[PDB]
RNA sequence: AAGACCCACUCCCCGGCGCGGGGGCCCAAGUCCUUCUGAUCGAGGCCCAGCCCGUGGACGGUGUGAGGCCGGUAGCGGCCCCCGGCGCGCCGGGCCCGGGUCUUCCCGGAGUCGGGUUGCUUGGGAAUGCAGCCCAAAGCGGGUGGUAAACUCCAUCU
RNA sequence: AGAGGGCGUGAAACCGUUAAGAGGUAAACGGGUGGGGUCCGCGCAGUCCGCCCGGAGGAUUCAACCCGGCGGCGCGGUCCGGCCGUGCCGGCGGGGCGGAUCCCCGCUCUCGGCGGGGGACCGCCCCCCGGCCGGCGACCGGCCGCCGCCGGGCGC
RNA sequence: GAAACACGGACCAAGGAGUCUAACACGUGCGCGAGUCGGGGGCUACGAAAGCCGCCGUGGCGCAAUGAAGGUGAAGGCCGGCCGGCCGAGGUGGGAUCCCGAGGCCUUCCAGUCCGCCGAGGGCGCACCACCGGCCCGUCUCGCCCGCCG
RNA sequence: GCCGGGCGUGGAAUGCGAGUGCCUAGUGGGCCACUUUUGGUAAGCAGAACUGGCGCUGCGGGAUGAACCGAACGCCGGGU
RNA sequence: CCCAUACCCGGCCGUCGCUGGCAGUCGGCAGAGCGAGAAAGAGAGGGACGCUACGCCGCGACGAGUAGGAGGGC
């Protein structure tokens, strides 16, 4: 029984909905249980970071996103290769792996195993046991200065270059962007079907010639 | 907007009141010395017009600087500008009756059917 | 508001030192019940238990 | 000072906060209605009452 | 509140603001938005004209980010720069143009809506139209692509 | 994976033994002076400490209405068992292991996929999923790439 | 016990009784008066309030002065000085932050390209100043004066 | 159309019926304002509250429409010789308010200024309304031109 | 179709401030009368036109009465 | 000559209107007016009450009501 001018309703209440109300009464309480193990969680690994392992850097698919970077799943074994590190022994010292990347750039490729090398730097290496430390380990006195890291270890900060203003050229100036497009747009269309009249253009030569 | 209407000839030395509120516009670039009197103004406002040396007044001010409002330009900002408007006047599926109708969301399967495509039944 | 005037800093014993601080903007600032009135009887609500 | 900030110091501990502003300056209008400006510009007050 | 609402002002009154004659059923029409074609015919042809049909080409797997394009008009185009960027440019003497990236603020295309402040400018965005490349150009600046 | 040539340490894991969580019990200060009442936990007062305590003014009990009568409350308070945990040392074992380079080898899941068809299911639309029946594989193959089909390129998983 | 073992409080319907009144158009009701009770009015000799006159008193007693204290206002035509500025301005300044304004450590193929740190600039804030502007009636003191009030002496 | 030969009703007590959630629309109040909003997640007895986090605004709605779709995407004039400069964001009528002022407002009289006030007339004209233009998208007719890496 | 300029004794009487936009409940069984009027022998019948009533409305009158005649209503005193 | 809740006159309540009036309680820093038919200047060379302004005050006119709508409830 509609009224006068209002709007089309579809309200998705024609099921039984009554007894599937998820109500959040949890959410205060809940966010208590999330965070007193995850204060908990940092008291077993002390000197381990918070955060855990470090993430790469991971550009976005699906053209609305690509000009972003997030912080992905794990490194990819290339990324690891490059770098002088085991995929064995990664884990083992808090760098995140995942074998089901690839690396289809190496703008992309590059740009992570530095991030891998400022973290193997970065890092103290605590000996295994303490009255005899390896050679991978790191200096006694530098141990002291072992505090538990907050946050994301080693955040993504999605920087821009920061350019300057140039003088405009002639050739700038006489480029015809609009049209330039409207030309990229026609053959990437057209392409195709000039291929094929194309092909039979020599086919209609060949039965002249003899 | 009053900007707009303070270039108007016989004027420029008056003082711009209105009982509304200003809000800056982004897409002016030169501003000049303004005597405003609002009942509010936005931050942006404000930073703007004091930036380019202008006035800004209360009505309270207005009244201790002039009590009949003598060389002042009441203004007002767009009455019927909200987006509500364009819901009104005669109803849509009518002749001639450019209005637009409540839509839960736009596409090509809302409201482009029947009443509108003269392939389909009909249209006004 | 055409001055913040300069309030005195008292001890532990009552009396008043020789410090003096600037009385801060925010107590200037405009005394709106109406909206004291608006925001006290909707923050109160978020206390509240559920009942059935 | 940091926590709300006076009104051309926006505050330090919020992230882009500053205090509201007044709607009207002098706020009581008994020394407004007494005025010289305001005085002169008035007709006279004519409260001759006329009963029936 | 309760005590705002309009049953506080109907109690003692019998029909409770519904009327004796056409007393208060369950449902006289039809629930939902039933008898569209139907006894509800004149309220669909008077408010919701189009209502009933088809009409286009039914795309199945429709991926909104494929059809991503937030366009930015030219005037509010150096609201994408500080202000620092604008004065310094109509200060400089070497004719120095500031390049505004367009795709750094989130917009990709560029539509001409209206004046542009005459100083050289050299936008880096990803679409353009024709009339937004008129005012660039006009002005003294240069339209850019990127990808 | 094996071979050769280098580089690099050889100590981790099982079986025995010793040095907070649960329960019990305690922890401040008025029944002060008059005065109301059947009964006071009431009313008044306790100065120059405008009684006393207060990290304790939650609550309950108590012959009306109690911070100071009682149990409690507060305390990163004490005391007493009990269980777990934390390393260390001993005895008995198990345990000799890695990485890079080069060569030479090796490598895949079937009445299943897939196709037809019927029925159910799905937003899945010339069939998304599931199942029956018939058909029934391949190995530079196979699956997917949201319109049925051929051809040809890519991409992507196994 | 007007709490007496289904007992706190103990309503209405209904019933018993006592007291009052009425009673052949069923009762009840509206309006208008009348009569009768019921209690109340603590009703029964009915107003206080100024002001001036007249007659009898009693005080520590008025005015005007003297000293102390407190307050108000000041155009003091323009007192000195503070503090403050949702006032600007003047900085061989000292600063901490903001900006899409422009040498070096680090770095992947000594120069070209690149990331991090400084520096120059702009704008902001505040501080150390200098001087105007203005208030102190959303904020002040010491003076000076006029007035007032209180206290105490006198006065009698 | 009920006093009805229409139905419910012996009497008394207590119970007893437009609510809650979601969505939408309009009106209204408040904050901010080309922005706005943390609702989700984090961060440091009452308090399961409150505060805070923008390098938590991802995201929602808004700032741009139109087409079934590929797509396209919101002023012009004027001079100098397709090019170089200049003026450069409609008009008309009705419009609250404002603005100028032809004049004209008493102490024994005359001259007489500052300020204030009044006013025929003439103006800039808010919002909004009526109309004529202009611009973008679809589509149609007529055409005549320009551009370039293939 | 545009400009520009000039003409108010406001060009019948009477009365009265208008314009305009939102949101919107109830209703969508009606009934009666003068006059006109169709079917019907006719009907307190059925069906229309115009205006007013009743419904939604008491009051004075027609003894009585939804509609007739008068007249419409805050609570009161006087007059008519 | 009789009388209606009609009409006239008067009182009181309320609503509506005048988008009415009042900050002027301007006092020995004083001088008591703006009821006036006529676009505008009382222009300068010791003293009751009041005004919860969401208050107070003055004029007019008006008052039926189911369904329904709204406002106010010290």
Redesign the pocket.
Known sequence: AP?????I?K?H?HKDWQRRVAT??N??????R??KA??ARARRIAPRPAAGPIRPIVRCPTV??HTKVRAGRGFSLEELRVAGI?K?VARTIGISVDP?R?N?STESL?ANV?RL?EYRSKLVLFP??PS?P??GDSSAEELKLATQL?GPVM???????????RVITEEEKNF?A????????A?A?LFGIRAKRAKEAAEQDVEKKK | ?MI??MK????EN?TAVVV??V????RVQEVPKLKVCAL?V????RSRILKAGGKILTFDQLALDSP??????????????????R????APGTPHSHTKP?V?S???KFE?ARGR?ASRGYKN | ??????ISVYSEKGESSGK?V?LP?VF?A???P??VN?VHTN??K?????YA | DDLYG????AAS?????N?????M???????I??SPEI?????????????? | P?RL???????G????????????RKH?GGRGNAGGMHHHRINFDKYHPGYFGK???????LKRNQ?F???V?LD?LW????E??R??AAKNKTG?A?????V???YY?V?????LP?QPVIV?AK??????EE?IK??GGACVLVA
């Open positions: 009224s006068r001018n209002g709007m309703l309200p209440f959040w009464f959410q205060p309480a809940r966010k208590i999330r965070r995850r204060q609305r996103y085991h064995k089901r690839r289809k590059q530095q090398k295994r046991k005899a390896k050679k907050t955040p993504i900060r999605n920087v821009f270059k920061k350019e300057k203003a015809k609009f049209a330039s497009l409207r030309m990229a747009r053959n269309r | 907007r707009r209407k108007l000839p016989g004027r008056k509304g509120t809000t800056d516009d982004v509010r936005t931050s942006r406002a009949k409002g003598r060389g002042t330009v009441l203004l007002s900002g767009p009455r019927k500008g909200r987006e509500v408007y819901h009104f006047g005669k409540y839960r736009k596409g090509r482009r495509r | 508001a055409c001055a913040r005037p300069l003096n600037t903007a200037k405009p005394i709106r109406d909206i608006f923050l109160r978020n206390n509240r238990q559920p | 006076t009104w051309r110091k501990l919020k992230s882009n906060y205090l509201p502003m007044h709607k300056l002098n706020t009581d209008l008994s020394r209605l007494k005085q002169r510009a008035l007709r006279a007050p004519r409260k001759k009452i006329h009963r029936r | 309760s609402r309009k049953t506080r002002k109907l109690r009154h019998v029909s409770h603001g519904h009327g004796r004659i056409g007393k208060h006289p009409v286009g080409m039914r795309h199945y797997h059809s394009c937030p366009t008009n509010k609201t994408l720069v500080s620092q960027t004065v310094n120095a500031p390049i505004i990236d367009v750094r603020s989130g295309k539509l001409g809506k209206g004046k005459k880096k679409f353009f139209s024709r009339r937004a005012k006009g002005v």
